[model samples]
Target: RFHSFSFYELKNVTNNFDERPISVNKMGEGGFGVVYKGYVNNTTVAVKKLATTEELKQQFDQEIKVMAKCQHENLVELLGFSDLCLVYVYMPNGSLLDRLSCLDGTPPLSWHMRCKIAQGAANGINFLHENHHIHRDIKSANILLDEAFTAKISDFGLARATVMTSRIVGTTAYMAPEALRGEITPKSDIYSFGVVLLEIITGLPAVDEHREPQLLLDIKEEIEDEEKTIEDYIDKKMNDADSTSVEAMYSVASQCLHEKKNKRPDIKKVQQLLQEMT
Candidate 1:
């Protein structure tokens, strides 16, 4: 069985249940709760605190249960869990979103690195889908990276069975158009993956209000203008923005964001494209 812990035990593990923790690197936060870097059993790990709300708690339980049975190099490893917190194998390098955000002086991703990250994530999602599961949300912010910049899909909180029929869910910005219409399908995931590809190619927020108008509507339209080469959209600070590789990256991204979901490639196919790029 996967490891388990008591609520009180976790409180003590985190040191007198300090709400305002110190010496811990603040990772990221969502509506559910915040993530923090911590150490347990002499091993570094990440602890996610689920909100006290009933709905949130239910989701936390579902995610922990589902993910505990999953194991893949491209998927985050669940170390253990307690009443309100889930422990994951610590990814010291942090999230791809964090690394891509340019908050620090770190350079932008190299084309090869970006392709590898994208491929790894695609394989993980493909595995989930093949098992009749679905990752409702497929955005970069949910992709975590370890010390070597190897990618792993994390934050399965938004995930639900491919069979969900009651209500729609996912981030609006990167959401599939059909998802917004409340008729999500396998193709819906392809749509979201296309958006993620866009984010990788262009280091900009998917739909920031401050950016150029019409940029966020459709990725095909975003790069239709050849004048805006891969270099133009790429985060200038990333390490791997070479002309040849960047050009190749743009081509695959464009194909993935095809106007029709049917025209877009499946996760496995998408992985193949990235593999060839390398």
Candidate 2:
């Protein structure tokens, strides 16, 4: 149920996407278009100035369809859109990547907050799976954080209705082994979520010089030894981390990173496990 907007409304909301004296509201670009902070009745919003390419039109249509049907607290709300723009609520805290890396001048979120974010994101992915939709891409950057630190999954440009297709696509670092082998499934998304869990725990980049770009299933195996603890794999900044909670999350992530897609727990089970941890 995509809504059509008159150019007048777009002009009124975005001030014609004109350059402003203040650049702080410029939210940067994505695959579909450049995003800017806008206002509707004095309420802040994010407005995407979509590109006109045929490829972008396909992405725009797909995104509108997917987001229209997905309305959840953990999913970003799509307010409306024009022929060339899509509007969403502004996320003041930016993406999870920014918060975890302390790139936005704010202090890094604590362990408990990270746990909450992990749960919130998992809930969003679970909703998508329940609806027979594949997010196609799940990563720290696609997970937006609101002012209260609630995680809202965003950017459905690559999302597709459930079907078997060999067209493998998405960020490389978060892709599951099956996905890399050109088989995309809900389990592929679970694998990506596991990578995000690792990011939440370590406050590290998805792919770094020290680790391979793919989500390392081997790390899970290495941590299974009785002498090893989840503490050894967590971020050093989490000095006050709860060992019990961290261990619980570690177990969940390990299952999510299972080498066999059939072995990974479904999102609902993942949600229950994370709920208990929190």
Candidate 3:
């Protein structure tokens, strides 16, 4: 599922990572280093943990260990790695977080694009859960998108594989109840999936402070608003998007975020639903 490059080879591939590297693109801050888009042997790629940090070394190891064994269209591929450097299939569009937040001077993701990206990510995470692995943290920021806008799961710094459903470690706003208690399993990933789904539908981050209660809580409040059709939660850019498709997407999102873990559909089921809707 992967390959490793020697330290010297990595240096050669990045052009001694020139003072101002060519084909350079900045991704968001990982706990490790400022991720960058670069080229290797004329092939575009993403490099991580380039700047040395004690904390990031462990994160790189964790991400490598988790992703090296998995293969899926929606999951990011580990192209090669070496001490102080890791390369991935270059995602020219950067992380889903960038488009959602409209950072890096890019346009915000439209409602339709956001929904499709979210679905792709769900498919990958579902494959992981099916293998008995748990994605302890799930959020838009960790969802990277390539030039084709294919969503790939990134950042495995807090993932666990064999824990029971009791301990959880992740971003608080997007965590499931069981994860909040420090208990985690595949089902835990299922919960975080729901939060992201809800966010995709509402066009809001999970814990936006400027808003009341929280974005998730606030959006849930819309269930009671008579004039606000579920369609109202859609991003304005999606005005011309397929209404019937989005309507079904919203219903699937609602199901994923259901209050109980058992009640919430697992990743496989979520994938099935998206296929049906499409």
The best-first sequence of candidates by TM-score reads: 2, 1, 3
Q: Which stretches of candidate 1 lie over 4 Å from their true place?
A: 17-25, 104-107, 162-166, 214-219, 225-227
What TM-score, over all chains together, does every model reach?
Answer: 0.88, 0.88, 0.83
Candidate 3 structure quality by residue, lDDT tens digits, 162-264: 2454333478887766667756667667667777776666666788778765657446556656645766666664454577877777777777666677887
Better of 1 and 3 by TM-score: 1
Against the unseen true structure, what C-alpha lDDT does each candidate score?
0.72, 0.82, 0.72
What tens-digit string does per-residue lDDT give for candidate 2 at 1-278? 65566656876766668645343345667655777878877768888887637767888778888988889999998887865888888888888988888974678789988988999999999899999988988999899989889999999988877245656678887888888887868999999998899888878777766664234444566677654556666888766688888888888888899888999999999999999997
- In model 2, where is the ten-residue run with the lowest total lDDT? 210-219
Candidate 2, residue 159: Cα displacement in angstroms equals: 1.5
Model 3 segments beyond 4 Å from truth?
A: 12-26, 50-58, 108-112, 162-168, 224-229
Clashes of each: 6, 0, 7
Error of 2 at 193 (Å): 0.4
